[PDB]
């Protein structure tokens, strides 16, 4: 993380912590531009300690008095009912063993199920042809070419390209 974008990680949560405490909507909305004037103290300057002392005093009065049980937007890392839908929980590929008269239903769905597998069954003449080439030695985050230079299939095929939908 860099020093300039360290301002941005605080700036969104500076106002996000405030609407936890408000009672109206305009009461929170009146303090948006009102807090903006403090942000408009040093508009554009150098990147040295003058920009760090604006953040070094943003240690206090940001963590100091921070969010007394705030809003959480319940579908989140925290919050209630964040992972509540777990009786279903999307067991993708639980459907290998059937021993049919249980595979009687959905006839066209299984006919398409084996169809997509040939896209995964034939990708390593193309994906592994660039997997040895795109990585220089052992370097950074290893996504492929996002078109794979002819046809990107996927590169992340198929557990990510057919990833779990929510309900």
């Amino acid at each position: 993380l860099t020093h300039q974008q360290k301002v941005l990680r605080l700036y969104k949560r500076a106002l996000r912590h405030l609407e936890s405490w408000c009672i109206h909507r305009d009461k929170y909305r009146y303090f948006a531009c009102l807090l903006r004037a403090r942000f408009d103290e040093h508009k554009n300057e150098k990147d040295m300690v003058k920009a760090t002392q604006l953040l070094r005093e943003a240690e206090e009065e940001f963590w100091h008095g921070q969010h007394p049980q705030p809003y959480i937007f319940p579908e989140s890392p925290g919050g209630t009912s964040y992972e509540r839908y777990e009786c279903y929980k999307v067991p993708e590929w639980c459907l290998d063993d059937w021993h049919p008269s249980e595979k009687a239903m959905y006839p066209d769905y299984f006919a398409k199920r084996e169809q997509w597998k040939k896209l995964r069954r034939e990708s390593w003449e193309r994906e592994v042809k660039q997997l040895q080439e795109e990585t220089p030695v052992g370097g950074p985050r290893t996504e492929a070419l996002p078109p794979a230079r002819k046809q990107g299939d996927l590169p992340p095929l198929w557990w990510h390209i057919v990833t779990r939908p929510r309900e």
Partner: protein, 83 residues
């Protein structure tokens, strides 16, 4: 129980262009790229969807949100939109 399709977000992303009084309703609809219109123009432009949508807007959502239709693109991946 009420479902949702592609047409709801195509209203709202275009609507907040006119809701924000700094941006006139004469820009481009889906691809304005936001540089022709540092803080408070990559956060404030999505601080309104913090109020309306507000699914906490993670750290990678800032650097993608320049292309204003690329804003709309991954929401259908998150919100699991039709077909």
């Amino acid at each position: 129980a009420p479902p949702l399709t592609l047409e709801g977000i195509k209203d709202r992303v275009l609507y907040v262009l006119k809701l924000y009084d700094k941006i006139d309703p004469e820009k481009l609809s889906v691809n304005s790229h936001f540089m022709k219109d540092d803080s408070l123009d990559q956060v404030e432009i999505i601080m309104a969807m913090e109020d309306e949508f507000g699914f906490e807007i993670p750290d990678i959502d800032a650097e993608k949100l320049m292309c204003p239709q690329e804003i709309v693109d991954y929401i259908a991946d998150k919100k699991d939109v039709y077909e």
